[PDB]
Amino acid sequence: DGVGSSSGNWHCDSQWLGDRVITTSTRTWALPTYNNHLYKQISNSTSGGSSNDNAYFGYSTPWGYFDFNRFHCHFSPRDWQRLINNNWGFRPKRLNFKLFNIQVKEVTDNNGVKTIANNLTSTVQVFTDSDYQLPYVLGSAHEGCLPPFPADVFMIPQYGYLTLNDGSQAVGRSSFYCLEYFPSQMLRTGNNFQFSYEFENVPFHSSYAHSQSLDRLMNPQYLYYLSKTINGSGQNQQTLKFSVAGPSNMAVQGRNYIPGPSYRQQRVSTTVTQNNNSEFAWPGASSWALNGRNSLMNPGPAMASHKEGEDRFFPLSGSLIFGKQGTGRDNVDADKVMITNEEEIKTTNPVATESYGQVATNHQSAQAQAQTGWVQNQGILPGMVWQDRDVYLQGPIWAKIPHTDGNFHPSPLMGGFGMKHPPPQILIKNTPVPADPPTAFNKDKLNSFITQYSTGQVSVEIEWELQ
Amino acid sequence: FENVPFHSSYAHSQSLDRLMNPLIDQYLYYLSKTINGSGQNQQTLKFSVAGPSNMAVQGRNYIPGPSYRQQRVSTTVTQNNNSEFAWPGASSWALNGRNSLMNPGPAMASHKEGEDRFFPLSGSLIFVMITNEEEIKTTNPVATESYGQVATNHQSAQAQAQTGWVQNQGILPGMVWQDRDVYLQGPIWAKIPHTDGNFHPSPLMGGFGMKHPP
Amino acid sequence: DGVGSSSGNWHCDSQWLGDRVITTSTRTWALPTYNNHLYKQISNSTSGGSSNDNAYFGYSTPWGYFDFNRFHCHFSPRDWQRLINNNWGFRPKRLNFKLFNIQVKEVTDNNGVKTIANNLTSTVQVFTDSDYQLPYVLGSAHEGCLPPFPADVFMIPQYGYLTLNDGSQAVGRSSFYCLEYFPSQMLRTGNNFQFSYEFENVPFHSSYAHSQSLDRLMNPLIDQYLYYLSKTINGSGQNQQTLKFSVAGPSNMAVQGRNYIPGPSYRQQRVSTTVTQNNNSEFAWPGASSWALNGRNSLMNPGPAMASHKEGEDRFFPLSGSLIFGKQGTGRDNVDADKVMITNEEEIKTTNPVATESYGQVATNHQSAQAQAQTGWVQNQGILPGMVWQDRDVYLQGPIWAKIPHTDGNFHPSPLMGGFGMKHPPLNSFITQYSTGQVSVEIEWELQKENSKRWNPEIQYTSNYYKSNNVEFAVNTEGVYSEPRPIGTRYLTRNL
Amino acid sequence: MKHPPPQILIKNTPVPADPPTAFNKDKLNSFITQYSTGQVSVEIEWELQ
Amino acid sequence: DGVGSSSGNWHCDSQWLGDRVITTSTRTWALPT
Amino acid sequence: LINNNWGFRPKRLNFKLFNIQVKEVTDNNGVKTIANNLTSTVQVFTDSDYQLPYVLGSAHEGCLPPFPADVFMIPQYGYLTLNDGSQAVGRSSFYCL
Amino acid sequence: KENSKRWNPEIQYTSNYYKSNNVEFAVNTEGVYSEPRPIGTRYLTRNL
Amino acid sequence: QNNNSEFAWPGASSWALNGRNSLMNPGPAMASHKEGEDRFFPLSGSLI
Amino acid sequence: SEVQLLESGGGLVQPGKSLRLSCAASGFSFSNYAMSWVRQAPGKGLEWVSGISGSGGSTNYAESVRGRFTISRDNSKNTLYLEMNSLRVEDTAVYYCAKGMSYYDRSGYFWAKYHYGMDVWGQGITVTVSS
Amino acid sequence: VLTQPPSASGTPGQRVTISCSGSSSNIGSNYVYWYQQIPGTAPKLLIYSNNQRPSGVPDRFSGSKSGTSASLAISGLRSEDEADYYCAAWDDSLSGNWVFGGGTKLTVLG
């Protein structure tokens, strides 16, 4: 509207009505100029590379982007506490996004003693990608999200995207997207921006632990099992005997459903003396290989962290590990981080550090004993039932389902809601305002720009449905 | 009753691998010979039309369902190993550290054609009366047999090709399978546990899986 | 209607309107008499049946069948180029079939001279199975389909089916089907036949290659809040066990947590086009990846959709994981590798593991003070929650549809050789006699337009600029039409 | 003329001879020797100056 | 119209409909004296 | 365009000029500061009667950049008229825009 | 639009597929957007 | 293979106007080279 | 190693006789690079004999081999051919097939300066000219 | 022709320079390429377009051209870096030829 009038208020409350919850978050953002308003090629060699599995090729953009991918953005500890105790499930419904009170500052630095002043005629470009035509980077559990604490001011992250590579080079199939080539809205300090988004139908996250265990669903049968293959010690004692499956022996009863899939993880103790004296962080880890590159299987299939009665053992990459406030970047100790575990899901799921079971590896005969082998990984089988991974106050909310010919149980492995059309990416940058031209025409693009940045407010509203 | 598929009470008259027309060739090719003959440095690549003469090598659009191998037991006792292998030699699944017998488990053919004496250890419903699932062999691998073979390495001038037996195989795109048959003494329905996800909820002892049963 | 009146016209053109393509193809056919008007039981022991894997039992019928199931029947090489470069996907919608200009000939051979004359009173029997009550042989990649070139005159293939067997013998559950037991329509030289079919809903085949890879979906500039166990020991020495954690970030991209994992894998043995690199042994069948059914071992050909080779390794091909097409005039048995065209699925590597590589590694034991952490290779991996994968590509030479077998269950029914899976797809003394006529099939295709915002130019399928003795996809001097290469549909790109 | 009188193309439809009784995928090279005859009348209206 | 109100938005794209193509190009310029 | 079409040609044209910003360069004692001048104007017109010399057909430099993120400098308008050597002639024309 | 009845496939302008330090018609590591080659308009064909 | 002399302006095709020679650049549309030739180009024939 | 070049037709030839060499190229678009033949005499440095343009329109030859040798390529068959006539003992060498690294097309022109640089070579075939 | 010293020597971890002298027609007006060949093997490209280098080549190999002379410098010399080096450039004179240098055999002492 105008410079002498405000374009929006401070909205920061959560309202509970019936089975529907509305959450309102409002923050103050600080956006700088990135790459001096240039698209730059970034690759393996720029960061020094030298690792095969780490080779990449892509582009860094002058544009920034807005992300609200964690619950603690939308949930205070109390509101999160009211959520998990009284409700079996929840899921988003609608998303409302506003951008207001845009400010832009110019930085004049002459022999130090820098000065900051309002630049009133500047604009701030913003657009949403609602056709999902740009790469979607918001499903990778990144930093730069709105801080959990409403009085904190955060720095808007820089947007970038990776495309195909062979080593540090680029194959001709690599794509280069220009974010300037998208129609966008330009906001001076008095203009405001908003849009609405509708969540597509997704199942409720199951915020509960099963009272019963998959094996013990019985009532303490008319089916029989083979109890004895021999009468006793001696020669030629082979025989077949059958006994009723009943309360006395509950392991051999016939069951309708079997536990879900498993991909074994290496087990690590919190007491280091019980661990092997070697470097097995990488060599002893579960990975998957794609185009000859090995990527760690983290978190991977949702499985119980440990067996009942064990607290000092955790899967090597099978869990989400959060850092404490003010945690160092490199080689921090174990008490500096928070290792989450998924004990609740053990009822339906095998332990990540245990084998799924055993199979017959041969045919028995008079000359051969029955042999078995351990099943380290087990794909889907008819009759499997399983639980997904839990969501945390610090964890991500949703992920984007890649666009492919096929997928199975699209729910993302880090947890949360998988969506073919997730909430769109919101891209933003400062409109470049160049310095004084040479006064004689030059065909070169202008490389001189006034040091400048913008700030303002962001309000995100999400409607939830409770079960 | 909530909507459930018809239980299919029939046996396929055709087998999964024989669906071809026996009189006409495929325009597809396969690798017939990797060497010219016996000797040194005889490596070569030869291709041949996949056709009625060799039906094993033809391309196919579908493959049999999953398998979890059960131990094989003969009804003639002297043929069995002279030891107690009931529990120790049986396929199981461990949950929270507790081992449970994998009974019946994945629907699979009880035995190969022409082999009635044998029966899967835990793979049959025993009422004694031991049931079999001969009908499902057309699309279902045998319970006591491996699913197939898989290359375990890369061949080279130095290394000859090696394979290994797949004892159990999870779902793959292209699999088709039959469920377990229902019996006069067998169950009708089974409640589907309330979970984040499941696959082919039909229960493994037979019958109609239902989220809201009686 | 009459002998001197034409019952149809020649329709053979494709129309592109909006997001739809209608292709009409007309060919000239000739139908002989098969099995001398008889049904004949066939089996393996007639050919000697020296192998159990090759055992079969069935029947052979006098009937023929029309098969248009290959793409090049309905598309010219130009129309196929126009399709693949401009579109992200396509799928069939409606089908129309016409049979007209029936001409029945008699051949009278007296002494050593034979004479051909029109027998006007004769009829031709034709019926289509819309209840799918007969064995369906059209989804087995067989020959006998309409020729790609319109001027070619082709022969109708003989129809036959297989049933249950034990060895060469039949079993009690084997079924016998008489095609005379179906109500059919009889046509003289003035009658014509037509029917119209409606395709059931199928997903668009994706004619594109991803521009991103499953592991590189991250933002390269920012760190991840999650941590990973970077170090387990201080350094060289004794009692140096320790646990350290680091931020997963742009520095190490292999260790980041990912929402999705690559598709399933069933490993293939790797063969190189350079023969000296292969082992000096007969490993075609012995070293093959197979699946056993009822005791018979069938080769896993092609099997699951997997990238044929690692990037930068063109020479290697999966042993039975790829579709192999013959060049024009290729011999039926023991031809060289230059007589066949080996297609590859290189474009799908972004979401799918390499066919000749392991899926990954797992932990095989529990690490302890007395035991090192051990791992093992996953040779085959079934479906896991969170997998994403691509199907097999379709080719100008490849098949179009396949019938989903009728079973209690299936997973991702799309056929493994490529194409659209569907539950309802499209007196012993006689006179020597045969028929001929015209057939016109009209299929309506739906398109999905390319919406990409990519700035730089796409890869396209283009014809070669240079001079050659023969124009590709044309006739030679002797008049033979040939297709030089197998053409995939994946050129344009999308984001992953 | 940019759009002159159109070309009129005509051929005899090939009538195959007797095919073999066993299937072969090769195109049919054996045809019945054939020709056709008939009448053609063209009528042009000419304008005079 | 106003000091703090933008006078136009950013339009760049190329929508192809039927037999026509509409191309839109937006840039930033600087004019010296 | 070039792969799918036998021909093309322009039909309509729309040109917008907006988001005007006037920066005044203040250089005091060798250091320079750039501030807004809010009351300054920028004159613009189009010649729709084709009265001025037409310089747009000589394939000159100074056009809009190919790449949307480039900021371009506007070229300076000048023209030419009749001459003999470096002299003018009585038929030469002068234009004041 | 192209109405052609040509049977064989036409020549098309394509991006070559091979590894390189850059992709054509994009920015390099310094932020400089270059156009490597001129692109003519004549690929499809007609009769004379 | 070129002549060892400076012929860029001397050997150039040009037209005269009011006593001033202007180079014929690009000029009338003509084929750059005969088919099968990739090493030759007209002196002022094509845009550069 | 995607790009692959093979040489065949090497052998022992008496002086005066002429033999033909062939190179089979794969892994790249053949007609878009200018191939060349480089020969290395035993215990001697590399020597460039001849190069051909991608279309095949223009060919160059070293003075020593000029008029006896002729280089041709079949773009349809992806083959580089070197026909040698009036061979002599001086020709005994290991001949290599080298692919021109620079990529060009019909829009541009062939430039012998830029397009003869060779990124990848071939194993080579020994050629012996002895009595 | 392009002139190169017949042999060059170095110690591991020590910089070594190989240089080729040329006429105006070749080194002076054309790009210079460097090929590394180990006997019994086809040559490998180290440096092309004067100072540029192909992927899969280590950072230590650096090449530069000044006037009619081009120098290839190797830093952090290794045992595997011992081979024969060939200097190449296009020659405008005498009908246009690609010229290779005489070759230089680098020996790693110690």
Numbering used by the authors:
A (entry chain D): 219 to 438, 442 to 688
B (entry chain E): 417 to 543, 558 to 644
C (entry chain F): 219 to 644, 667 to 736
D (entry chain A): 640 to 688
E (entry chain C): 219 to 251
F (entry chain C): 301 to 397
G (entry chain C): 689 to 736
H (entry chain C): 495 to 542
Sentences from the paper on this structure:
The presence of pre-existing neutralizing antibodies in large portions of the human population poses a significant challenge for AAV-mediated gene therapy, primarily targeting the capsid leading to vector inactivation and loss of treatment efficacy. This study structurally characterizes the interactions of 21 human-derived neutralizing antibodies from three patients treated with the AAV9 vector, Zolgensma®, utilizing high-resolution cryo-electron microscopy.
In each map, the capsid was well ordered, while the densities for the Fabs above the 2-fold axis could not be interpreted for model building. For the sixteen 2-fold binding Fabs, this strategy resulted in maps reconstructed to 2.54–3.56 Å resolution. The localized reconstructions with C2 symmetry relaxation confirmed that only a single Fab is bound at the 2-fold region. In all maps, the VH and VL chains are well-ordered, enabling the building of atomic models. The epitopes for the sixteen 2-fold Fabs comprise VR-III to -VII, and -IX of the AAV9 capsid. Other frequently contacted residues are T491, T492, R533, D556, N562, N704, and Y705, which are clustered around the 2-fold symmetry axis. Furthermore, for all the 2-fold Fab-complexes, movements occurred in VR-IX near the 2-fold axis.
